[PDB]
Design a protein around this nucleic acid. Structure first.
Length: 48
DNA sequence: ATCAATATCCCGAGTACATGCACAGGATGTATATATCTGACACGTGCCTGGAGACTAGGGAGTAATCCCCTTGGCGGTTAAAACGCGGGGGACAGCGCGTACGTGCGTTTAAGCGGTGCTAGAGCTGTCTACGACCAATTGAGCGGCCTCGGCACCGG
């Protein structure tokens, strides 16, 4: 997703769920910023 | 936006070696005639180059974002240029002789002709079988992440 973020940017997304988000704990990482940059009205998580 | 100091061009005169023409001649260009095979002309032939159809898809044409190489401008250091004096070797004339071109004589050596015959060439279908297509598992390398240790600033102590 981070590498190919440009491909996802041109496509609109009705819903987004990012399972196993326990990795998304460091805001200094590129993953955090890239995930934040997506334009989606609703965000859902299933991280345990 | 000019005046001195050089350098160059123009013209005239004394001078000379090289151009241009005539002469004697000799050997190569020319006219005549013969032999003859190389190439013009005709014929058939069948290889293959040109035309069109349909389908696949690799490749080209069009667009957009952008980071990079291109170009302009500015400055410091120095490598070459311009002109002076100093110094040596290029440049201009006679004497030898050993090379190069003719002349003469000889024989070795290729061209030519005619049988003889292995021998390279072409299409034969021959069969293998390397090498071009497709797929797949090896290492190499960079972009990332987690954690630990070190160092600076704000807070409390004497």
């Amino acid at each position: 997703v981070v590498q190919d973020v440009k491909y996802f940017q041109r496509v609109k997304w009705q819903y987004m769920v990012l399972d196993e988000a326990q990795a998304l704990k460091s805001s200094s990482s590129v993953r955090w910023k890239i995930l934040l940059q997506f334009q989606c009205r609703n965000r859902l998580l299933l991280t345990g």
